[PDB]
Each structure stands twice: as structure tokens, then as C-alpha cells.
Amino acid sequence: GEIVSNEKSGVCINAPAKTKLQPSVFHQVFEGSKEPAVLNSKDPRLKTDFEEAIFSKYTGNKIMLMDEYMEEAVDHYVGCLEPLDISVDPIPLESAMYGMDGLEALDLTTSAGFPYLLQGKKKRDIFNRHTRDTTEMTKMLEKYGVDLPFVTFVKDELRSKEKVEKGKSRLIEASSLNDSVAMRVAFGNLYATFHSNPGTATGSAVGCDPDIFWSKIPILLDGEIFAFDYTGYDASLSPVWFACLKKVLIKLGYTHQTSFIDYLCHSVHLYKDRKYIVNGGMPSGSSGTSIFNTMINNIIIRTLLIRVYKGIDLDQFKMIAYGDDVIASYPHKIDPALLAEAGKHYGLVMTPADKGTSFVDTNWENVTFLKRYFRADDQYPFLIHPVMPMKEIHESIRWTKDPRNTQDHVRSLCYLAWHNGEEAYNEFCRKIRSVPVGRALTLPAYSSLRRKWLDSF
Numbered sequence: 001g002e003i004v005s006n007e008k009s010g011v012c013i014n015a016p017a018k019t020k021l022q023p024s025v026f027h028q029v030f031e032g033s034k035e036p037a038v039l040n041s042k043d044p045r046l047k048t049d050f051e052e053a054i055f056s057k058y059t060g061n062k063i064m065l066m067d068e069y070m071e072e073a074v075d076h077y078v079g080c081l082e083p084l085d086i087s088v089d090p091i092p093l094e095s096a097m098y099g100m101d102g103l104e105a106l107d108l109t110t111s112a113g114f115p116y117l118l119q120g121k122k123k124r125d126i127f128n129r130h131t132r133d134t135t136e137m138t139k140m141l142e143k144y145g146v147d148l149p150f151v152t153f154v155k156d157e158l159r160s161k162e163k164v165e166k167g168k169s170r171l172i173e174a175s176s177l178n179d180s181v182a183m184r185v186a187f188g189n190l191y192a193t194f195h196s197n198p199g200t201a202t203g204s205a206v207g208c209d210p211d212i213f214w215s216k217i218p219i220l221l222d223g224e225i226f227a228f229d230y231t232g233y234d235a236s237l238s239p240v241w242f243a244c245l246k247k248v249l250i251k252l253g254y255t256h257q258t259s260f261i262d263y264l265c266h267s268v269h270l271y272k273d274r275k276y277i278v279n280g281g282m283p284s285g286s287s288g289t290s291i292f293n294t295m296i297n298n299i300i301i302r303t304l305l306i307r308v309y310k311g312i313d314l315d316q317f318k319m320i321a322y323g324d325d326v327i328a329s330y331p332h333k334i335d336p337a338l339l340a341e342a343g344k345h346y347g348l349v350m351t352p353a354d355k356g357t358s359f360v361d362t363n364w365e366n367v368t369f370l371k372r373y374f375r376a377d378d379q380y381p382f383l384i385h386p387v388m389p390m391k392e393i394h395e396s397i398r399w400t401k402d403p404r405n406t407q408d409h410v411r412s413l414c415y416l417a418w419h420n421g422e423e424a425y426n427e428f429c430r431k432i433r434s435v436p437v438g439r440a441l442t443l444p445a446y447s448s449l450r451r452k453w454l455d456s457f
């Protein structure tokens, strides 16, 4: 990803200077070091230029036409997807807006994007989940069209003290409501297929249920495990990776809808009173960002494997990925340090899994996926617990954007926490009930959460 242009947009995007994250009632109870991310360049916590930091993710492009490894990697991934029988047909407008089998309704809580945010117009002024009306969206598609700019927001989230000082805040590139809906029309059936088929054919975990799907993961990835980290994955994508993705879509039957992939690769963005064009890089908050980044990751690993290892047999290779996060398997040991050496040739920055200093071996006890660990059950060791560290749950419970939502928040964290055991769950359930706001909530018991968990298999 490279910013090839920066011009005067003609409009102004005014984002708020103050974060919505306020310390919660549990700010003192539990310990934590994360603070709200830097949103403006005048934040006293800064220790370097804000706009230099947030845009430095664009490290440049490796301009190249698809090499032979990419072509073979593309074919193999197409071969894995062939039995899924993906329909390139478009889904009706009502389903793209309000949902169908395997596709949740479009999220109404986020920005409608350009130009609606400049008109005091929100998604609920066009969308109406109760009536499921489409006439307003049809008129809006007719009036403002497609291939509209993205709106760059600083992501208002918790970050480490280190990333607060270095200004490493993340960005949301919010698609126009027109382009999200139109893209969901073009690729909706593919989204549904992926969401309903997490595994090693899709190589995807998007739309999965960790409670259910964690047990299938070690069965699918039944060989020598390896994993690694990406630094700035989305923005590091060169256009050639978008070309591979296009060739995958073409082999599945897509024709005119590959234009949406061009729309993500060569993208227009609005930030403040600026209008900048990025050559390459995946936008953060486009519809289908997760899946297309997941499909591109399938192409990347395969490409690197063929390039590094001489007589690799991709039909013995298996992987599951969610955006940049990937867990992979091969019968013989694969060293990610050698793969990273090849990924730098393509502009990819691959580093040891989970911020480690060294490249050490990956096993079913240290490996994580979607921040969660793998721990088998004691009574049913064939059932694998997805274990979110209590650390992440403490960092999260300590802040809130809406103290009215404390109940939903805490119980959401209870669905994640009880996988750490009876000891951790009740310690965390006891510390919550240690303040007046706590015991007023409804906290499920360890035995009850377990009851529904095992009833699902």
C-alpha cells in the first residue's frame, strides 16, 4: 500500500477529539495498562507526530505481475473452493441489506459513509429492519451511485501504553453505504458459503463460533503446526495480491464483479479536508474486508510455501485464517522464519507468533487464534476450550463507552471467561460482585454455562 496522491477534497470530515472510552466501575477492581487510543494530534500523551505514525502503515508496493508461484497457489485454492459450489449469482437487495441464511443483517450502528455523513444522514434513515424496506436504498443507489470514497476514522479503542506514545492508532476506512450494499449483492452468496463452511477448504474461520469450531480445528489441522504474526497486514498488501484474488474470483465464475476488488485495491479516502488515493492495501471497514483478506491470506501462504520449500505438496497442506490471523499445518515441520524471508520479497512483514522475540516452535499449548488458546476439556478431552486470557478480559472490563451497556458487556465477557476454569471464573465473578454495580447484574454460573456448552455437541 502506497499513498500516490493527496489533494484538497472540497469537503471536511470532522471527527471528535475526545474518546468515548471512560473508566468503568471496574477500573480500580481489576488491573490494566491499556488506555484509549490517540485520536488527535494535540493529545499530550503523544511522543511523536500523530499523522506520520497512523499513515506510516503504507510501506510501499512491490510492483510486479503474478509470478509462477502465485499462479499455482491460485489454482490450488480454487481447487479447494470448487466443492463448496459457490454461486456467483447476486442476492436480492433485501437480503444484502437485512440478511439471509449465512449473512447477518448489515450493521446499523456504524457510519453510512460518504456522502451521508455530510448530510446528517444515518443508516437508520435509509434502513428499517422492521419493515425491511428497500425503496429508499434503491433511490440512494440511483442518486449517488457506486465507487464512492472511503471515510477515514481513527479507531476509538484501547491500545497499549507503548502504542499510545508512538501514535500507533488504527484507522477505520468506512465504505459508503452504497458500496457496502452493492458489494454484498455481488458477493453475498460467497460470504454465506464461507460463513457456513469454516475449515480447511475455505481456509477461513470468519463467522465461526469458537465454542463449537475450536473442537474441529485440531482435527482439520492434524499435522505439524506453525503460525506467525503480520505487521500491518492490510496496508502492506501490494496490488499483485489483489490481482491473485481477482484470478481466484474469475475461476469461480465472477466477471463484472471483480471491479469491486479494484475498488478496494485502488481506493479513494476522505480524511479531514483531504482526499488521498492509495495504490494497494485493504481498507479496514469495507464490507467483505475480513473474507477478502482471508482469501488473500490463503493465496499468500501457498505462494510462500511453493517458493521456499522444493517439493511441497499443497494437497497435504491445510490452513485456517481470519484476516491476517492464520493457523496452519503440514505433515513435515515448516519454519515460518524461512517463509517470512520470502514474504519480504513480496512486501509482507511476517514476525514470530504473538510478538515473540525469537522464532520458536508452535504447538497446541502455546498457539493462539483470534486471541484464544486451545485447551482440551478434562471430562471430554476431544472438546477443546477456546481460552481467552483473563488479561484481555480485565483490560476490557475496566473501560466503557456507555455505562448503560455494562450488563451486556459483562455477560459477553462471562461467555469468554468461564473457559479458563472454575477457579478463574469465580474469582472474576466474585470481584465483579464486590461493588454495588456488580451484584445488580445477572452472572451465569460456571455449571450452567458448561451445561449449554456440552449440549451443543
Ligand SMILES: Nc1nc2c(ncn2[C@@H]2O[C@H](COP(=O)(O)OP(=O)(O)OP(=O)(O)O)[C@@H](O)[C@H]2O)c(=O)[nH]1
Pocket: 155, 170, 171, 172, 229, 230, 231, 232, 233, 234, 235, 284, 285, 323, 324
Ligand atoms: N487499521 C485497522 N486494522 C484492523 C482493524 N481490524 C482488524 N485489523 C487488522 O489488524 C491489524 C492491525 O494490528 P495492529 O494493532 O496495528 O498490530 P500490527 O499491525 O500487527 O503491528 P504490531 O502489533 O506491532 O506487529 C491490521 O493489519 C488489520 O489487518 C481495524 O479496524 N482497523
